[PDB]
Design an enzyme around this catalytic site. Structure first.
Site, PDB file in Angstrom:
ATOM      1  N   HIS A  14      -9.389  13.540 -25.384  1.00  0.00           N
ATOM      2  CA  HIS A  14      -9.011  12.228 -25.975  1.00  0.00           C
ATOM      3  C   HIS A  14     -10.616  11.829 -26.780  1.00  0.00           C
ATOM      4  O   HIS A  14     -10.700  11.028 -27.553  1.00  0.00           O
ATOM      5  CB  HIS A  14      -8.792  11.192 -25.227  1.00  0.00           C
ATOM      6  CG  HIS A  14      -7.346  11.238 -24.911  1.00  0.00           C
ATOM      7  ND1 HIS A  14      -6.725  11.416 -25.292  1.00  0.00           N
ATOM      8  CD2 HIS A  14      -7.356  11.757 -23.634  1.00  0.00           C
ATOM      9  CE1 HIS A  14      -5.488  10.726 -24.901  1.00  0.00           C
ATOM     10  NE2 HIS A  14      -5.779  11.798 -22.785  1.00  0.00           N
ATOM     11  N   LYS A  41       3.172  17.987 -26.580  1.00  0.00           N
ATOM     12  CA  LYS A  41       2.673  17.265 -26.520  1.00  0.00           C
ATOM     13  C   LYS A  41       3.215  15.530 -27.161  1.00  0.00           C
ATOM     14  O   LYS A  41       3.092  15.854 -28.538  1.00  0.00           O
ATOM     15  CB  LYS A  41       1.144  16.474 -25.836  1.00  0.00           C
ATOM     16  CG  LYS A  41       0.843  15.759 -25.173  1.00  0.00           C
ATOM     17  CD  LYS A  41      -0.647  15.727 -25.006  1.00  0.00           C
ATOM     18  CE  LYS A  41      -0.400  14.018 -23.491  1.00  0.00           C
ATOM     19  NZ  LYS A  41      -1.829  14.115 -23.553  1.00  0.00           N
ATOM     20  N   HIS A 115      -8.815   9.109 -18.077  1.00  0.00           N
ATOM     21  CA  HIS A 115      -7.669   8.437 -17.933  1.00  0.00           C
ATOM     22  C   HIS A 115      -7.461   7.534 -19.538  1.00  0.00           C
ATOM     23  O   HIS A 115      -7.965   6.922 -19.192  1.00  0.00           O
ATOM     24  CB  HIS A 115      -6.428   8.386 -16.991  1.00  0.00           C
ATOM     25  CG  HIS A 115      -5.355   7.925 -17.532  1.00  0.00           C
ATOM     26  ND1 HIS A 115      -4.056   8.618 -17.184  1.00  0.00           N
ATOM     27  CD2 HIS A 115      -4.592   6.956 -17.630  1.00  0.00           C
ATOM     28  CE1 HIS A 115      -3.157   8.247 -17.873  1.00  0.00           C
ATOM     29  NE2 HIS A 115      -3.042   6.553 -17.900  1.00  0.00           N
TER      30      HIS A 115
END
Length: 125
Positions: A14, A41, A115
């Protein structure tokens, strides 16, 4: 070493400090480089900017508790969302890019972001 893995893993999937295109080609190359193409993805968000301010979302300097266990950022971040095109689960994984600036939601572990909440939608600009 002492498990820093989840944090490093979060950065690999990310984080991209200084991107130059933020377009479809950018997503195609980045999804491939960061190994998110086997299988393709469906969606992945890359955060840009200052790494210290992302980590800061886990503390009160740049974050607030959200939905009990998550943290929402106080400041906006430049982000590029890559969304998969076509119905195949195999490469070439083509993507459409969306540039935006918004507050983000993350999950932390030991004060480190581990996350990214891809389901979060924002009060638009």
């Amino acid at each position: 070493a002492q498990d820093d893995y989840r944090y490093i893993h979060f950065l690999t999937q990310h984080y991209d400090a200084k991107p130059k295109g933020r377009n479809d080609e950018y997503c195609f190359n980045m999804m491939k480089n960061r190994r998110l193409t086997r299988p393709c993805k469906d969606r992945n968000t890359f955060i840009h900017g200052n790494k210290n301010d992302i980590k800061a979302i886990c503390e009160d300097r740049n974050g607030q508790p959200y939905r009990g266990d998550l943290r929402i950022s106080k400041s906006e971040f430049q982000i590029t969302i890559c969304k998969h095109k076509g119905g195949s689960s195999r490469p070439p994984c083509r993507y459409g890019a969306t540039e935006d600036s918004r507050v983000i939601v993350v999950g932390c572990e030991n004060g480190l972001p581990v996350h990214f909440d891809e389901s979060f939608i924002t009060p638009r600009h």
